[PDB]
Amino acid sequence: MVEIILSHLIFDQAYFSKVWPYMDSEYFESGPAKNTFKLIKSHVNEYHSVPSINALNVALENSSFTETEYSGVKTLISKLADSPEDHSWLVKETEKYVQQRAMFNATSKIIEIQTNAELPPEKRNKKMPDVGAIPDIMRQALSISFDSYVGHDWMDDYEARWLSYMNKARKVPFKLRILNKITKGGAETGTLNVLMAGVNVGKSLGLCSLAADYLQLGHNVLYISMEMAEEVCAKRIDANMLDVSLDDIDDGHISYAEYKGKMEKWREKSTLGRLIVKQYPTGGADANTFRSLLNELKLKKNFVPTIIIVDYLGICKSCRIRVYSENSYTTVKAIAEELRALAVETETVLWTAAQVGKQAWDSSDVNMSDIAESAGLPATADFMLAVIETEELAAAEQQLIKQIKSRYGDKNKWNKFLMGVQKGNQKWVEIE
Template sequence: MSNLAIKEAGPAFFQQYGKAFQEKIFQGLAIDKDWAQQMHEVMKPHYFELKYLQYLCEKYFEYFDNYRCFPTMQLLIQMVAGDLGSEGSDGILRNQIVQFIHRMRGNPHPEDLPYVKDKALDFCKRQAFKEALTTAVELVQSDKFESVVDLMRQAVSVGMPSTIGHDFFEDLEARFQEIQRITTPTGLDFLDEKTILDGGLGRGELGVVVAPTGCGKSHWLVQVGAAALKQGKTVVHYSFELSEVLVGKRYDAHLTSISVNDLIENKERVTEFYEDHEFGNLIIKYYPTRTASVNTIRNHLEKLKFRGHIPSVVIIDYADVMRSTKAYEALRHELMLIYEELRQMAGDFNVPVWTASQSNRAGANADMVGLENMGEAYGKAQVSDFVLGLSRKPEEKDKGYGRLFVAKNRSGRDGMQFHVKIDTARSKFKTMDLQEIADIDPKNIMKEKWNDIQRTKKELDYG
């Protein structure tokens, strides 16, 4: 590759990360143009250890220097073909680039790409700052103190997002481009429909189910976890009250439709069921109540990613009994911080996060549990993207039904209430049809009782 050597040589700083990580760095450059512009300020092509990535990165950045925009992947391929397609060019390099592009196309949206981007940008910014410090020492020795101030100010600012924001009139076209929102369904069609969740809870979003104690919050979290498993997704379920085995049994009951109390004597049926069906992956992790903070969850997720378990959805049962990373005199401030950190974690790991919240006393007897019923800290609702109220009165528990109320929704409509059947033996929620809803209507029940009294009276009168 002597005739195609990169213009600026230097140490391959990315060598410590390995081939797969380095390839994802370049894939991030190709996919995210804004991030590529940040990296352009702090990264050099020679940071890559792999020669074909050095070559592609130099072509990519060189195009930006000339035209102030990055080339599309198709244009970059044409540029490479023009350089390496002639006789006498580096055939090995050309084949390596072709194979790399095939790998990129085979996995166009790696789930761990946000992590790779954050790690790479942070490393490059640190490296740029180290180089600036070295230069600053030389300037101080030469008594060029004003230059030191300018140099350090520049070192701090490099790698920061360069956009000024959305120019309303100049960027009009951007508002009419469809935004791809990758979702995880709840398993209930009326919630996942386009006008409400439009497919389910999206990556980077925080969903909260609010209900009184014993109403079915944990069962709801199993419902959404099982729905994701059926889609082939990787689910990480954290429990702070129920054991890992008990949570696992609830998933067994939901997926196999066998009552949780009958699982032991139906072990063979359960085993055969999983052999005949394909699901995603489920990791269940238990922490004692008020011992795990959001940082604990972050560290565990990092360990899972290191072992190849990339989460598609994270379920936390439940946020109100987590430990705050900062102590406050008032509990509501700690709860507010927990929810803010969960929302930040959802964005950092690019996954939907579902959790639950205990309602206040008023919610126990309410026909409809809303935002005003979120216990201790109303501010929990402010950072949540989707809030679902779950209500079940004692007589409704006995008959196996309840109500879901869409209290808040950043993705679509809210304010709707839905009647649902709740099978706690199988942790399943199902839609009720119109006849079933009519059968439980208090007015219809009273009318039917009145008709029974009238019929009885007639029978006695004519008896």
């Protein structure tokens, strides 16, 4: 590994600028490698630039080495590699090499300290550190890392953090003006967002509308369905995207020509993403099967999603609980925690839906207290939008969206808003 390290010190710039401050003579060897590194360090000190092979050989010629040292250094210099290895592997491997050598040196030093300690006090070296310095020395061996990034350091990462607030690095817009207004620019990555459906409110209509909106904005969407097949969910997606009514597809009003024309028109647009629909049996998909699905999609389909939409939280299974119940609070709390952990670890926006409490069903207003999942969903959910469908709203083709929990912004800023639900095309349109 030392040959590679020296070669990419000589014949690279980013690697040099990254690993030079953490490079010491004692890390290499007691033979040709140490002499070569001493030549490199001397040249960089006298001339603040990376030496070339000819300059290195000139320095070796004008240097004080014996015959064996001269031969070793000459052979090593003639054995340098200009191969362009990948940067990440090179940095990680040289970090591991440096750490191993530092640990070996520290262990040898503490062994020598102990050996010197067990010697006649009249007869010992004064320069050798005392035994009490042993725990600190090993610490200096363990404090060797090319790059230190343990968490977010306030007052040490304020310039990077400001670039996050200006660039809105975490926000993902909604394509609906009202939803962008109440989220201060959309939902955030690594979040769990749920919709609470009361009486006459399907849970998959809103999820399909969000999936279509994200698809039109260029995002990779992974729709995991539980109670429905892949074809049915993709048919809801087609209804929303192709403007064809859902019943028109089953009846046969729309022909193959119009369908293919609309699909190719969408394919021509470069602002379109990819939608992958995966079906799982009811209760047969915990938030560990989703990790395997993501791994398979990344490896085989190269599909790395930014939006993950689960059809229904209640139908899912808690991996931690193992035992499954049709409508149990402990499972819903665990499922929410597991899904939010998946969202955080995958840096994706995760969407799901739940049913509101029966009292919430009868009452147009839904309270966090009036929720089927109490203290379990309004504790692990960054955003919880509530959807109300009464008779008067249904007659006007509308649904009252109420904001029950908003980690993003103030919940009471714009709490109630009317949404233009179309149940045929499975779409949400704004209301002026």
